[PDB]
Scaffold this active site. Structure first.
Site, PDB file in Angstrom:
ATOM      1  N   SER D  97       0.817  -1.185   0.000  1.00 15.27           N
ATOM      2  CA  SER D  97       0.000   0.000   0.000  1.00 15.27           C
ATOM      3  C   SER D  97       0.850   1.233   0.000  1.00 15.27           C
ATOM      4  O   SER D  97       1.640   1.435  -0.913  1.00 15.27           O
ATOM      5  CB  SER D  97      -0.879  -0.029   1.203  1.00 15.27           C
ATOM      6  OG  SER D  97      -1.853   0.922   1.100  1.00 15.27           O
ATOM      7  N   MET D  98       0.766   2.040   1.037  1.00 16.21           N
ATOM      8  CA  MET D  98       1.589   3.232   1.061  1.00 16.21           C
ATOM      9  C   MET D  98       3.058   2.875   1.104  1.00 16.21           C
ATOM     10  O   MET D  98       3.896   3.661   0.686  1.00 16.21           O
ATOM     11  CB  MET D  98       1.232   4.136   2.227  1.00 16.21           C
ATOM     12  CG  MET D  98       1.869   5.494   2.165  1.00 16.21           C
ATOM     13  SD  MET D  98       1.310   6.313   0.744  1.00 16.21           S
ATOM     14  CE  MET D  98       1.966   7.923   0.755  1.00 16.21           C
ATOM     15  N   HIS D 122      -2.803  -0.981  -4.121  1.00 12.08           N
ATOM     16  CA  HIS D 122      -4.255  -0.867  -4.258  1.00 12.08           C
ATOM     17  C   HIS D 122      -4.731   0.581  -4.192  1.00 12.08           C
ATOM     18  O   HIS D 122      -4.044   1.419  -3.627  1.00 12.08           O
ATOM     19  CB  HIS D 122      -4.918  -1.687  -3.179  1.00 12.08           C
ATOM     20  CG  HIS D 122      -4.633  -1.209  -1.886  1.00 12.08           C
ATOM     21  ND1 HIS D 122      -5.381  -0.271  -1.288  1.00 12.08           N
ATOM     22  CD2 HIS D 122      -3.660  -1.496  -1.048  1.00 12.08           C
ATOM     23  CE1 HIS D 122      -4.890  -0.001  -0.130  1.00 12.08           C
ATOM     24  NE2 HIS D 122      -3.837  -0.723   0.046  1.00 12.08           N
TER      25      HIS D 122
END
Lengths: 215, 116, 192, 192, 192, 192, 192, 192, 192
Positions: D97-98, D122
């Site tokens: 993710s991040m 995502h």
């Protein structure tokens, strides 16, 4: 030239080592190291290496000298510095160079310097010139011994590239030249395969980069 | 001008240099810098530079030359300071007048016009 | 090792501080997390400390915060305005609510913001439970605060007051380029 | 002894430090756990410090994290782009993710990951409660963020924007060799 | 590093002190948070310590607090009146309830507040459970306290006692200019 | 004293370190508790430190743990393979699940285990909630991880892949002599 | 600094102390908060330490407390009576219950209290659950304690025993001037 | 002062040590409280550190503890067997279960217990939830452990194996004189 | 400043001590709070230290405690009997239950107490849940303990065994003069 390594004066008790112990203290009758030297050789060049590592108390010794030209020996004699030149070297570096030396050389000290001389990094041309100088000194010794020596350009480029280090500068060059060129030659000359009237030309072997020659 | 640099006396070990080593000590027969200078030159100006760098116990010698006029060497001879002008210099109280107080309202901070 | 140590060379060759005291020395103050009372109290002490060390030099304040208590945030606002040296405010991450208010309060011409940051503004929140008489007292006070906050926004941004009032009715989000056009910041930093 | 001490010799010796301060000295920063504000702020303080120490030398960032808050993560992203020296990012464990986003933000040619690592990407998550009017405002802001995150992915990876959009609709997992082919990292480290 | 360290220079210098001890040395004391028992005990220790250091100089008390326990607050009050040097109180953020009583108690001519601060005053709160006989005893004591607090407000502000009683029936909020007009503070600090 | 201090003579002497820092200096690292993300990160920092101290000497890793997070464990695994010097792993107490995996990853010929220890291997665990579409996305990823873990077991133990596949169906317990026969360790230490 | 540091001037130098150790040196002990065993154990250690330092000098005890455990309070009481130097007690804030008991226990002629303080006294509390036989045993013990505490009050205050017994049946609150008339303290401090 | 400090004269000190480090220096290790996984590693580190300084000197291990994890104090057993010195395990308070397991493991002829101590021995505990298939697997492992612990008791105590099995089916308590007759210890210390 | 610092001068001087270590130096040990396992372990270590510093001098033990665990209390008892110097026990505040048994265990003739202290003695407590067979085993062990404690009380106090059993049936409270008559202590300290 008088030379002192200031890295040997990192600890507090070594300050008296430079001047001499007070009377009644062990070793006072041995004298100092700095003040006798400047009495014996009053017109000398005085070089202090790595003055960016000495214990802070030696700086008071330096400030006194820079301020008025003299130190008093533990026997009461005067060390007269009016005819000597003081050169101090450092790896401190201008603001950062300043802060690292300044930390002890506070403005009270820096105002006592006449100048700061800056020493530049070596270029590729210089490392080749330095090698030429080293090779020539060997050529002179060999001529005196009756042997002619010529080092090829590919041999010079390699030695200059190998004996130079951005982190050590030209210092490693002394061993690179001695170990690759002077040593193999010394063996042959002494053995007698190469004798007075002989000639060697040194080429590199492209697959080894060794200095290869014979007669 | 008799001039001494107090930065050379930063440890409780440089006092014998001024007055002489005790009998039976390696430096005994040398004499002593301060009393010899004063005996030889009774009329003089005596300057002690940066007297804020002498080891604090060196002050206890001066505290005996300022009140009575004399200092005794290791042979029992006395220096006589009655015709000597004594000057000591220092920058000890300086770095106490170069700052401002911290806060919304300022103070004075001048009475420590360096009594410190 | 929640906060790393760093070593510097000084007059005696060594000082050993953390990862935040070292930067305070370089006149950098960080403001992060909720604007409470204990944290605000510490920022004010740091700003007063730096003013005394050198009244002529700028102080850099890094802002990254979701908002907080107005009362706590009015300290700091008044200190920034009281003290002599300019305080330059830099927005990273976000400056929301009270965070945005302090961001625009920096010295004029020195209100910067990083390119992917966000600034968000809105009217103040609050509440009360009690007798109808007490409810009125507390309702009036929150309305006065709303009015005061709007005037300060108009003063610092250059917007008319009426425009400020319309824009804080509901959460308004501004991208870094929008904050520049609006007048919350003077410019976008790019590269050092 | 949760964190051990190490000893090093320089001039006079002593000056003992912790295991993490010792590595900060070697311009190595670790990023682990969730990305949040208090932690992100420390990563930034360390990068500003190292820049000041030596603007010409690379900073190594170790990335092992499951994800986190976008705002906090963006403050890290912008600092990396702003400061002068290159930041070389190395992925071990996971970058999800991040975390994956920051991984690809390192200096081009210097993005490396260990061979058994995983990277997952995502679209951003979020939410809200309130009046239909407020819901509209907040829904618009999250969609703008989604759009911006996709532009930055396309910029850093070399993929077209449309390809990036399709690939983030559902959680997408990439093995270390897939991250290299896709364009998230430049290479896989093997042995010293 | 919740609280930063600072370096001070003097005769010998190299004095590493906390951001709060450095200010105590500047005769600055902070009052924040709730007026409890342990915190009040610490403020008194600091004021007695400053009185001995130099009986001829003012002590500055910085106030930012919502209120607290009257008993604890009274020990601070009595010490301020007992000791020799003037105590000058500065209100920022807020001075509510007992915080407001601690503000007006400073030396006359030296009570100052920042322009965006708020001061709020009200009658004492309390309660009890027990037999009707005990309820009476406890009710009488809180009423005696209310009476005493009102006398002290009138004494320090110049308002008549009757006026003070009317104004403390329900929460009353005063802006910095009203605190000055009312008589809670002498003046407003603005810019250095 | 949760952790006792020790003293050691060198040159200047004294030099009192911790009970664990004294051992780190002896190139000894302990791995215990669950393998997570914050702890695994420290194990890696210690290995990188030791590698930079002397690239030619072995590091001893003492393992005593019930299991952990696969991702955290893999960052340890990859560092152990990347760094130049051999890591010799010693199993005392237990090595289960991910702990067993890291034990067999030590340098070949240098995998020891004490005689009353236990080693246990099993299949990887996981789970998920969501739409049928997301359930299929996450299910495939766990299966890929399972396959990868089996290949590394076969590589390090010498067993065929199918044999590894069968032996990980259910929890399988091995005594120290079985760890040697199976191929998880090379030998059993007995007496000094 | 939860607790600030201070610096003094002796024969050597430095000598840094806590905002409380510095005052212990001045023979000042603070008793604040609720009386219980660990706190009551530390005060005794301090009083024994000061007597030894100089048996011919007074010890000052500053009291601000709501009450507490009788057993713990009695070990303080006995030490105060045993040791040679006078212990002078000063009441600031409040002295309730066991706090008031210790207040009056100070050296005669040296019991002071600040002008706005409060003193409250009452019979002891307790309770028990168990068989009727056990209830009787515990009821007898609490009654013996009540009787003993009343004798000590009468001894130290000069009131008759009958008067003490009537007064402590219900919480009795006394203002500073009443504490003086009653005989709990000798005088009120006002201004230096 | 949870743990007090002590001083001792050596060469040019002074040199203070922890109330427990001072004793580690006296080759005395305490094992108290329940045997866990973190505490066991610390005991092991101390024994190795004591086997590094002088391997030709006994190490005393005082033991007062009610038991713990079997497979994590079965790693303090294997370090005692293996090191060079003799570990003479004195007893005090209680040695139950696993604690009584380690007590008997000390050097023969050097197992001592104080006269009012208690030693208790019993069959190991465990459990499991899952499919019938998994239950079988776990049941087999606990039985294997039970068998192994009995063999070691028979080995160290001199009892026949069957006698050991009968005596541990249910908890058995032994007084210090019975521990001697049974063979858990060699003797009882009384007075110096 | 939970625990203050004190200083003392000897040779070089300084010697900054935590007030409790300052008293350990004066061969004074405190026992307060519940008699658990960790706290008892620390007291034993202190007594061994003092007996190794000067075997010919008495070690004072100050007791103020409600009771605790018998097993832990017994290791304190056995150590006091084992070590050479007399241990003199003083009891201020309370000595209840296990705290009273150890109070009488001090050197005969040196069992002084406080004038307002309380000593309470009673039969030991315990419990159990399980099969009827297990209940029997545990019931027998607690009864054996009761018997042993009664023997030691009779031994140290001079009471017959039958008198001791009758007196511990239910809690018995003794005032300091009764403790003296009963034989629990030798005398009452009053004033220096």
């Amino acid at each position: 030239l008088l030379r002192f390594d200031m890295s040997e004066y990192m600890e507090r008790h070594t300050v008296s080592r430079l001047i001499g112990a007070p009377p009644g203290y062990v070793g006072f009758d041995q004298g100092g190291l700095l003040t006798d030297a400047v009495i014996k050789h009053p017109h000398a060049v005085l070089l202090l290496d790595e003055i960016e590592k000495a214990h802070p108390d030696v700086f008071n010794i330096l400030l006194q000298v820079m301020d008025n030209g003299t130190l008093t020996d533990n026997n009461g004699r005067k060390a007269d510095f009016r005819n000597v030149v003081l050169v101090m070297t450092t790896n401190a570096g201008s603001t950062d160079a300043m802060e690292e030396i300044k930390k002890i050389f506070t403005p009270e000290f820096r105002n006592r310097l006449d100048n700061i001389i800056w020493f530049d990094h070596l270029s590729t041309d210089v490392i080749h010139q330095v090698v030429d100088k080293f090779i020539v000194e060997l050529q002179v010794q060999l001529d005196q011994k009756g042997v002619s020596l010529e080092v090829s350009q590919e041999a010079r480029n390699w030695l200059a590239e190998k004996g130079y280090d951005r982190a050590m500068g030209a210092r490693p060059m002394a061993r690179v030249i001695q170990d690759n060129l002077k040593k193999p030659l010394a063996n042959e000359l002494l053995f007698g395969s190469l004798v007075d009237g002989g000639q060697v030309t040194v080429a590199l072997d492209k697959e080894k980069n060794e200095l290869t020659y014979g007669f | 001008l008799l001039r001494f640099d107090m930065s050379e006396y930063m440890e409780r070990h440089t006092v014998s240099r001024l007055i002489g080593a005790p009998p039976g000590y390696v430096g005994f027969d040398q004499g002593g810098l301060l009393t010899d200078a004063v005996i030889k030159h009774p009329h003089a100006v005596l300057l002690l530079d940066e007297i804020e760098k002498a080891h604090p116990d060196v002050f206890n010698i001066l505290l005996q030359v300022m009140d009575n006029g004399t200092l005794t060497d290791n042979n029992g001879r006395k220096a006589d300071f009655r015709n000597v002008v004594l000057v000591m210099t220092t920058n000890a109280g300086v770095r106490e007048t170069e700052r401002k107080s911290i806060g919304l309202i300022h103070q004075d901070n001048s009475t420590d016009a360096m009594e410190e | 090792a929640l906060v790393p140590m760093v070593i510097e060379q000084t007059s005696r060759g060594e000082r050993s501080f953390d990862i935040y005291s070292r930067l305070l020395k370089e006149r950098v103050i960080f403001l992060t997390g909720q604007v409470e009372d204990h944290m605000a109290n510490l920022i004010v002490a740091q700003m007063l400390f730096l003013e005394a060390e050198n009244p002529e030099k700028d102080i850099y304040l890094y802002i990254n915060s979701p908002g907080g208590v107005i009362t706590a945030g009015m300290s700091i606002y008044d200190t920034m305005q009281f003290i002599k040296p300019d305080v330059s405010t830099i927005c990273m991450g976000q400056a929301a609510s009270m965070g945005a208010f302090l961001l625009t309060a920096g010295a004029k011409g020195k209100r910067f913001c990083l390119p992917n940051s966000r600034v968000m503004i809105h009217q103040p929140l609050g509440g009360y439970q009690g007798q109808a008489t007490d409810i009125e007292i507390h309702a009036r006070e929150i309305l006065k605060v709303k009015g005061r906050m709007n005037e300060l926004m108009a003063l610092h941004t250059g917007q008319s007051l009426e425009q400020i009032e319309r824009d804080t009715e509901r959460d308004r989000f501004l991208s870094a380029p929008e904050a520049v056009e609006y007048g919350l910041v003077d410019s976008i930093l790019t590269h050092r």
